[PDB]
Amino acid sequence: LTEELRTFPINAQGDTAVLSLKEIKKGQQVFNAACAQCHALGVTRTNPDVNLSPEALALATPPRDNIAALVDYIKNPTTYDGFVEISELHPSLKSSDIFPKMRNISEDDLYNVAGYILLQPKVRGEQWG
Amino acid sequence: LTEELRTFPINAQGDTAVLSLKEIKKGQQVFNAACAQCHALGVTRTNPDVNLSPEALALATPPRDNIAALVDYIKNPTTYDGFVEISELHPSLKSSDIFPKMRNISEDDLYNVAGYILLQPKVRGEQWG
Ligand code: HEC
Numbered sequence: 584l585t586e587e588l589r590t591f592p593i594n595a596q597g598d599t600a601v602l603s604l605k606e607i608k609k610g611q612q613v614f615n616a617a618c619a620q621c622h623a624l625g626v627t628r629t630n631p632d633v634n635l636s637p638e639a640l641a642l643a644t645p646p647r648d649n650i651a652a653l654v655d656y657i658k659n660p661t662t663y664d665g666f667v668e669i670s671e672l673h674p675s676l677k678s679s680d681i682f683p684k685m686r687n688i689s690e691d692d693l694y695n696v697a698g699y700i701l702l703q704p705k706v707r708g709e710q711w712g
Numbered sequence: 713l714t715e716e717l718r719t720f721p722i723n724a725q726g727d728t729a730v731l732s733l734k735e736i737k738k739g740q741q742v743f744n745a746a747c748a749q750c751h752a753l754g755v756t757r758t759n760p761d762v763n764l765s766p767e768a769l770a771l772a773t774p775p776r777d778n779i780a781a782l783v784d785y786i787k788n789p790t791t792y793d794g795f796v797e798i799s800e801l802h803p804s805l806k807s808s809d810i811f812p813k814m815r816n817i818s819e820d821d822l823y824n825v826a827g828y829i830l831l832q833p834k835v836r837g838e839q840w841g
């Protein structure tokens with residue numbers, strides 16, 4: 584896994600960040616623990632269109648195709664059109680009541696899961712999402 | 713439990729229906745199995761304002777203060793302002809994927825749970841919601 588594949592847009596301004604492989608291993612864990620229930624393989628079980636594929640992410644509002652945007656999303660989940668807050672029903676830090684796995688999640692983890700999500704299509708191609 | 717307390721508005725047109733106590737016992741079961749996780753005591757764990765109290769229900773869009781409206785809600789969940797469908801994240805029949813307890817739910821059950829929900833404030837007063 585070259586440093587190239589591990590280079591992702593950290594924000595929407597185009598800035599790049601190189602994540603360590605270790606962080607990605609941790610992102611996967613958090614992901615497999617708190618997201619795989621409805622997102623295994625980068626899909627969205629109950630909403631096929633709003634996937635974890637680059638295309639879907641890029642077309643979200645705002646685009647969720649960069650680490651910052653993905654981190655924001657977990658901290659403050661919103662519908663695809665991004666105008667209705669769904670933190671009450673979607674896993675988030677203010678939703679840890681009905682989502683036990685969100686009680687010990689830290690920014691570092693959010694950062695890692697974000698890198699993990701963005702990594703998958705680079706390595707699994709269209710198998711992801 | 714007189715037949716009076718068991719008289720509820722079946723629809724928004726003001727029609728009344730008298731449910732049997734037996735049906736209410738069954739509604740409670742379905743409720744305790746599929747709703748108590750976020751609605752025990754008629755509350756909404758992750759959204760305090762959108763409760764199961766008569767006032768909140770009556771102020772929903774459309775009002776969810778009659779059996780038909782409540783049944784519709786479970787079949788097709790929508791935000792409080794009733795304009796965003798949240799069946800993908802809220803228990804419903806098209807949401808039974810992530811909500812196992814919704815796989816064997818029948819209209820009869822929906823009808824019973826609806827009666828149960830509407831019964832609680834009549835017997836628990838403000839303790840409910
Ligand atoms: C089921 C209970 C879910 C779990 C567990 C997680 N997510 Fe989810 N997510 C879910 C739905 C039904 C939706 C669509 C909401 C809508 O109406 O738009 C989503 C969406 C996302 C997205 C946005 C996808 C996109 O814009 O294309 C992301 C970034 C996302 N979810 C990430 C994510 C993560 C990291 C999770 C774990 C912390 C997670 N989700 C859990 C349903 C569910």
Ligand code: HEC
Pocket residue numbers: 671672681743746747748749750751756758759761762763764765768769772776782785786790791792793802803825
């Ligand atoms: C995982 C959590 C969860 C479960 C389980 C759940 N609900 Fe909800 N429910 C919510 C949330 C959160 C809302 C608020 C949605 C909104 O308006 O944004 C809600 C709202 C509702 C409302 C509308 C309340 C109002 O005042 O308008 C009703 C009716 C309702 N749920 C009934 C049920 C019933 C019946 C079940 C079971 C079949 C159920 N819910 C299971 C989380 C849950």
